[PDB]
């Protein structure tokens, strides 16, 4: 569900894509993501709620 | 005619009002009365 | 009721390959393969 395809500001989310997985899914775990830049290029990032 | 512009007793049919016998014009007559006995007693 | 007669009924209304499932090997009922059709024109008198 993305909330960006119908309702961005609102926030409400609306199905925009289906996975076809057969198979039911028991387990997830964040993948940390690094930026690669010199000190002057690096940047504060939002952080996300789970 | 309210309904056709656009509750719908009519519409669903499966149940229909049914007027109180008396007008509210006519239930004013019957008071206009009683307040004129009032008035006499 | 007096209900008006039904009149001027106004109608709203692809093509998925079945060909995984009638080639290669089938999978063993345990192993049973599922496979989602969504808005897509179908053919179940030719299969």
Same mark, same amino acid.
């Given at each position: 569900?993305?909330?960006? $395809?119908?309702?961005? $500001?609102?926030?409400?989310?609306?199905?925009?894509? +289906?996975? !076809?997985?057969?198979? +039911?899914?028991?387990? $997830?775990?964040? @993948? !940390?993501?690094? @930026?690669?830049?010199?000190?002057?290029?690096?940047?504060?990032?939002?952080?996300?709620?789970? | 005619?309210?309904?056709?512009?656009?509750?719908? #007793?009519?519409?669903?049919?499966?149940?229909?009002?049914?007027?109180?016998?008396?007008?509210?014009?006519?239930? #004013? #007559?019957?008071?206009?009365?009683?307040?004129?006995?009032? #008035?006499?007693? | 009721?007096?209900?008006?007669? =039904?009149?001027?009924?106004?109608?709203?209304?692809?093509?998925?390959?079945?060909? =995984?499932? /009638?080639?290669?090997? =089938?999978?063993?009922?345990?192993?049973?393969?599922? /496979?989602?059709?969504?808005?897509?024109?179908?053919? /179940?008198?030719? /299969?």
């Amino acid at each position: 569900f993305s909330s960006r $395809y119908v309702d961005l $500001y609102g926030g409400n989310m609306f199905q925009f894509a +289906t996975l !076809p997985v057969y198979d +039911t899914i028991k387990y $997830y775990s964040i @993948i !940390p993501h690094s @930026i690669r830049s010199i000190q002057s290029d690096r940047k504060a990032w939002a952080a996300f709620y789970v | 005619d309210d309904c056709m512009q656009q509750i719908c #007793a009519q519409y669903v049919a499966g149940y229909k009002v049914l007027p109180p016998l008396m007008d509210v014009n006519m239930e #004013a #007559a019957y008071t206009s009365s009683l307040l004129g006995s009032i #008035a006499g007693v | 009721s007096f209900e008006a007669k =039904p009149s001027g009924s106004v109608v709203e209304q692809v093509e998925c390959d079945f060909s =995984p499932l /009638l080639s290669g090997t =089938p999978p063993q009922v345990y192993n049973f393969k599922r /496979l989602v059709f969504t808005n897509c024109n179908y053919n /179940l008198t030719k /299969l």
